[PDB]
Amino acid sequence: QFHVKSGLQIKKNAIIDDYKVTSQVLGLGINGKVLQIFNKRTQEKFALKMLQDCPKARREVELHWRASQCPHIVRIVDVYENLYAGRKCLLIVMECLDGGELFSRIQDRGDQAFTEREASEIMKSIGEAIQYLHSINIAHRDVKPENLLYTSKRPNAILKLTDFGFAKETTSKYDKSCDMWSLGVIMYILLCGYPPFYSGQYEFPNPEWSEVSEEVKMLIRNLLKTEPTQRMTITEFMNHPWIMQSTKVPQTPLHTSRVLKEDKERWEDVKEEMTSALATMR
Numbered sequence: 250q251f252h253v254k255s256g257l258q259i260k261k262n263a264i265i266d267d268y269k270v271t272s273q274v275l276g277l278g279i280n281g282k283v284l285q286i287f288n289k290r291t292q293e294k295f296a297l298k299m300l301q302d303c304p305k306a307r308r309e310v311e312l313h314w315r316a317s318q319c320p321h322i323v324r325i326v327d328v329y330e331n332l333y334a335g336r337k338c339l340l341i342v343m344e345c346l347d348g349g350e351l352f353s354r355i356q357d358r359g360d361q362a363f364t365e366r367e368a369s370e371i372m373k374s375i376g377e378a379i380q381y382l383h384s385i386n387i388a389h390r391d392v393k394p395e396n397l398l399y400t401s402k403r404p405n406a407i408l409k410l411t412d413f414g415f416a417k418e419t420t421s422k423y424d425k426s427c428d429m430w431s432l433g434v435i436m437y438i439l440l441c442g443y444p445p446f447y448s449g450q451y452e453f454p455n456p457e458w459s460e461v462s463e464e465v466k467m468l469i470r471n472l473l474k475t476e477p478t479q480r481m482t483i484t485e486f487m488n489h490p491w492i493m494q495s496t497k498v499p500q501t502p503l504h505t506s507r508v509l510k511e512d513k514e515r516w517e518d519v520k521e522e523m524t525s526a527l528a529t530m531r
């Protein structure tokens with residue numbers, strides 16, 4: 250009749266007591282590395298972010314925490330304030346995800362090519378995650394496709410969203426829209442294999458955008474609005490068919506897999522421009 254969950258808990262004893270740390274790295278992001286780590290008790294493998302521990306982070310985690318309670322959002326498992334260099338530090342231990350950057354999994358699909366239906370399912374999921382956050386007044390502000398990774402390597406395997414180095418409480422023109430933009434961006438690349446290209450017209454090339462229902466070309470629009478406003482609210486976003494259908498979408502082939510094999514070089518480029526588009530955007 251009544252249920253809550255563990256409040257956030259700043260464990261103080263050296264994480265080296267509760268885990269054995271590798272040096273084998275994974276994530277190579279904002280503040281420091283992401284080391285693989287093993288749970289002494291259970292013996293499972295984990296992601297370890299590490300932080301300077303200033304007032305800022307101390308809420309960034311404080312949110313991540315609230316968010317992990319979601320399926321498609323990465324779960325935090327433990328948060329430790331230890332002393333590294335000489336620096337009241339901050340070690341967050343979160344669920345390892347042996348999946349690979351959302352896209353970098355598709356170009357090793359091995360069997361067949363991609364599908365409008367499969368694109369939905371992906372977007373579909375990612376939608377959900379954003380919802381939650383918004384549904385609790387949280388903006389991620391950083392919904393890159395590096396920040397999307399899967400649990401494991403099976404096609405059953407699901408994907409989650411990471412790096413709240415950017416999230417912010419929508420507390421007491423705007424914000425929880427960046428996350429939308431991204432989804433839009435994400436959908437585009439999901440369907441074709443490229444973005445727009447500035448620093449705004451988005452053309453729709455032929456051997457790609459063709460018999461592809463304007464029903465779908467609709468969404469992408471509303472989302473990508475160079476605007477802050479009428480960028481279709483997620484609440485809104487969910488409502489539209491394609492997404493909320495699970496399985497009623499056309500089975501149309503998608504070149505995206507192959508497309509990405511075409512020009513593996515355009516990526517280190519994509520990534521920055523994606524962060525450019527984002528990060529700065531107010």
Ligand SMILES: O=C1NCCc2[nH]c(-c3ccnc(-c4ccccc4F)c3)cc21
Pocket residue numbers: 275276277278279283295296298323343344345346347348349398411412413414
């Ligand atoms: O918050 C973050 N910022 C920096 C980049 C970043 N990365 C992660 C992360 C989280 C969970 N798991 C992994 C992971 C695990 C196993 C194999 C490969 C992996 F990427 C990586 C989190 C963050």
